[PDB]
Amino acid sequence: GETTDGVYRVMTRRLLGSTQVGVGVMQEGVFHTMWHVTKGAALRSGEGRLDPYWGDVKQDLVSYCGPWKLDAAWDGLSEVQLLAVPPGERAKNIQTLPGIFKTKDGDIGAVALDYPAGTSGSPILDKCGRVIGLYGNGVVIKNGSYVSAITQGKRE
Amino acid sequence: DMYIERAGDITWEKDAEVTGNSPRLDVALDESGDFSLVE
Numbered sequence: 001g002e003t004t005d006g007v008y009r010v011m012t013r014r015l016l017g018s019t020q021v022g023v024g025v026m027q028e029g030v031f032h033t034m035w036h037v038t039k040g041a042a043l044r045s046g047e048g049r050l051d052p053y054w055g056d057v058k059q060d061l062v063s064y065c066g067p068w069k070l071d072a073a074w075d076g077l078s079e080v081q082l083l084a085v086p087p088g089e090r091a092k093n094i095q096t097l098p099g100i101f102k103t104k105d106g107d108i109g110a111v112a113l114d115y116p117a118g119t120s121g122s123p124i125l126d127k128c129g130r131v132i133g134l135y136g137n138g139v140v141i142k143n144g145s146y147v148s149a150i151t152q153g154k155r156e
Numbered sequence: 157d158m159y160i161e162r163a164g165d166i167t168w169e170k171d172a173e174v175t176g177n178s179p180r181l182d183v184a185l186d187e188s189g190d191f192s193l194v195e
């Protein structure tokens with residue numbers, strides 16, 4: 001059905017009324033989202049049907065219709081923008097400077113912004129407009145605030 | 157059954173809400189894709 005490039009909401013009807021489980025990015029005919037949002041289940045765009053193509057629980061990413069297409073990376077210096085699409089509220093650009101997640105396998109960017117779980121999958125952007133990752137997989141720190149990683153998949 | 161609805165265009169908005177801190181957290185990524193703090 002609809003295959004226009006942009007940001008989309010991921011909704012469900014199995015619960016009361018209509019509920020937003022997450023968000024995603026359509027780009028180059030491919031719908032990119034976080035795995036925990038859909039659990040690898042097939043999606044419906046209008047009357048059309050999107051099917052999973054690639055997925056990985058550890059990376060917490062999943063792509064529909066084709067391979068992962070987003071490949072831009074945070075430079076470690078510049079401020080970025082979270083294009084947050086919160087449940088029931090309009091899309092909103094929130095600019096922030098990312099922090100760091102120190103892992104045994106290397107450092108990853110991190111955005112310390114607080115949004116409901118249904119915002120999982122919102123794109124993180126750079127000054128060029130390129131999607132440098134998805135927001136929605138992270139950790140809760142000492143003061144109850146939420147800090148997400150800048151999750152980016154690998155292109156082919 | 158899940159479905160998608162368009163929410164906007166992917167573009168940088170000049171002069172938008174500038175908020176949020178930038179912390180250096182020590183974390184661990186498990187096989188189930190879950191993050192956890194390390195101290």
Ligand SMILES: CC(C)NC(=O)[C@H](Nc1ccc2c(c1)CNC2)c1cc(Cl)cc2[nH]ncc12
Pocket residue numbers: 036060115116117118119120135136137138139140146148188189190
């Ligand atoms: C558990 C929590 C600390 N982690 C999150 O990142 C939440 N989702 C989430 C992410 C990854 C996995 C799962 C769930 C399941 N297993 C893989 C999540 C997202 C957002 Cl946008 C706001 C959140 N507030 N509290 C949790 C929360």
